[PDB]
Ligand binder design. Sequence first.
Ligand SMILES: Nc1ncnc2c1ncn2[C@@H]1O[C@H](COP(=O)(O)OP(=O)(O)O)[C@@H](O)[C@H]1O
Ligand SMILES: Nc1ncnc2c1ncn2[C@@H]1O[C@H](COP(=O)(O)OP(=O)(O)O)[C@@H](O)[C@H]1O
Ligand SMILES: [Mg+2]
Ligand SMILES: [Mg+2]
Lengths: 418, 418
Amino acid sequence: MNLTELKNTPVSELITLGENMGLENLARMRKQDIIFAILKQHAKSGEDIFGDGVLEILQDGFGFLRSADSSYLAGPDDIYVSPSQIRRFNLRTGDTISGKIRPPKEGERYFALLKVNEVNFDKPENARNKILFENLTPLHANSRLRMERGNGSTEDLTARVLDLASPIGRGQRGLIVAPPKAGKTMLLQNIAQSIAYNHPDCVLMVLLIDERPEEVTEMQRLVKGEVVASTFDEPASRHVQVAEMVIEKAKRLVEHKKDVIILLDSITRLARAYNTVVPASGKVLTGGVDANALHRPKRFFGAARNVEEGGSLTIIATALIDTGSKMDEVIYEEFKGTGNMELHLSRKIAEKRVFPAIDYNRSGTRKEELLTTQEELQKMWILRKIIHPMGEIDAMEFLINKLAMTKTNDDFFEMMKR
Amino acid sequence: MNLTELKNTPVSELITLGENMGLENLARMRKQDIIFAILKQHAKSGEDIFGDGVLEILQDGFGFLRSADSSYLAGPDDIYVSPSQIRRFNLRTGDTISGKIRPPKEGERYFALLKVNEVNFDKPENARNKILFENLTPLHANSRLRMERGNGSTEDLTARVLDLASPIGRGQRGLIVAPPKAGKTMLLQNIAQSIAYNHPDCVLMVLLIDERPEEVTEMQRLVKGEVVASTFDEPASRHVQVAEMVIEKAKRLVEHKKDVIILLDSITRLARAYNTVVPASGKVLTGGVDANALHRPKRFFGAARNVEEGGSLTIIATALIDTGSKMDEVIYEEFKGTGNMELHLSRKIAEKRVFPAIDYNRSGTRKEELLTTQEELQKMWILRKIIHPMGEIDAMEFLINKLAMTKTNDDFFEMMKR
Ligand SMILES: Nc1ncnc2c1ncn2[C@@H]1O[C@H](COP(=O)(O)OP(=O)(O)O)[C@@H](O)[C@H]1O
Ligand SMILES: Nc1ncnc2c1ncn2[C@@H]1O[C@H](COP(=O)(O)OP(=O)(O)O)[C@@H](O)[C@H]1O
Ligand SMILES: [Mg+2]
Ligand SMILES: [Mg+2]
């Protein structure tokens, strides 16, 4: 069979298939080992076996084909690719390769690619001449992504508040700032649903760093897209490698005239992982953070842009404030003006149980004239004028009150205008 | 005879039994040595011996059946299991194995397992088909573990405050943050009694790390369950290995659709022990800690989850703050967002002898709507709105005063809803 559907099957069916297929015991070891054993047993028969995965290039030169189901985790069933194939077809880390794999011979442990018949969802002879990501000319965002749903529910209400506070376009560097227990996970979930329903063409890749396992499973079940996460019990190098693989896959996809949206769970956690994994350079700032250590997360965050040739990369990351650890504060301070927009969540609104707890006065994008029309954006300015001279919690309560009895954004605008 | 009942008799009775059996000089030797001598004498008598214990696999390949009465301490009375037996039944560390044992022969110094007839309180055939713990999908806790006894005693007051402050469900990852001499040991004792009374079906395990011997004896006498401890006069390797044994036994129990609960006296002490044991990786964070050193305690804490297939693993661990040590501070900093519920004990409330010294405004759980009913959630919300403005010590004094005048929490809510 094909490795993808074999891996996607739950464990019970895998065990039953292995036990009625010839193997003797599968219940008491990991899913990756069961997959490897089933593949090895089916491979000795001689039937061709297919497989696909994202390419990760090691420092030696050989590469591996990790899978999204296992969250890009190194395992016994990873496909091995020699540098000969990398020379034959120009391949970099993050490329998606699909083809047929060969059984592992003596002296080798992992499977190997027989021949590749898909690179980045098209022919390799057509994909090895594509211009690279950094050579593309960045531009300001000009195509707005609408989170308006129209169903009229509460998630629609918070999506409408999101649209009012800061419009979202393709290729921006959006940043969310939020205290703990302020509702940022639900905000990200609602953004994911809005993106999935409104713009099915865009590629959505939710990335969670240093997350709890239950949150990972809930996000995987809720989101109609690629979700990759690394729980907190895993080492920092695991977080770093997951982030690198995600960003490389996003760059490879955007080089093919595709729109990619990345919903990073915590830029703070990624920065902490990078600081942990980056060797000490002898320079220690406040909170024990090195500038060269912060270079990598800044490089990850700055890849968001709009491509003149085609496609875009919209990175929306979240940051943690007033947690109590100085490292988060210094990360926020060195991440103040990096993004072209910001949205602030208020703890005071959260404890009042008024959701979403968006601080309208402090949140807001810039250069939004390129995103929306003229009259709607003028309505946005006059709403800003109305909201400005009054308290943020009262402003948020007023916004929920005036968005609840109406139905969509333009209806609220015309009701408020008169 | 049976070994696990021989290990539970007092030392004086053991000495009398060995003396009337025909043994000498048993008074001035350790309890394990007396047990081994009595076992050898009764074995050379000719009769059969039954023994049980939790399996621990050594790096060489063979394993030992440790006993929880000695808190899994290596001793002469441990049962040796050969790699052949670990191979015929695929066994992992933490498996509870019960069966007949045989006397040692020449060249070997341990009793050996003869014929295993119980694995994890099940026949050996069925225990081979249990799915590994890592393959199960974690979920949010949705089955409430009610703490209130309802007998009207003052010891129940703490439990009642718990039910108002931070509800606990099956599969929680609770964290208790308390200063020294704030009442965390009595809080854990109250939780253990409430669990043993309200939910007899759950498996209760109390794990004490770096403890004092008198506290160990007190907890063993009080707690109706399994108590294993490693006192402060033992090497860090002992703390580490006791923690691994407990967590592996818990995972093996959970794999059999059992819901188990672990009460960790100090995650800080466990992190200390792991930092001592784990070799350095060249990078040392503030206070003298290593990231890979802290990786294992994070795995221990993150093992807690609610299993979709059935069963759960609740872990409630206490963390130390304001102890004057930077290592504890950094450990708590790295353990902040991991748990899904936190309970804060305040030193100031303890100074004025107000118990339980719970910081109500800081304590709480995540996704508490799953644990409680709708009306109960509304009552908790209005209570939190009432208590929020006032200071922590005033809040707890007022809450205790209000709670002392009722019998159950329903009556308290009805009195508040006047
Ligand atoms: N849009 C919303 N509508 C209703 N409740 C919300 C909303 N956003 C957050 N909450 C509340 O916040 C809690 C979860 O917060 P969460 O999203 O986990 O914040 P964080 O991810 O920052 O910890 C839930 O109990 C929920 O009641
Ligand atoms: N619920 C309670 N009721 C009465 N006294 C308490 C309570 N909890 C703690 N105390 C007092 O606090 C003292 C120390 O508490 P302890 O159990 O030693 O906590 P810790 O282990 O944090 O030091 C005890 O002597 C006890 O008198
Ligand atoms: Mg969250
Ligand atoms: Mg104590």
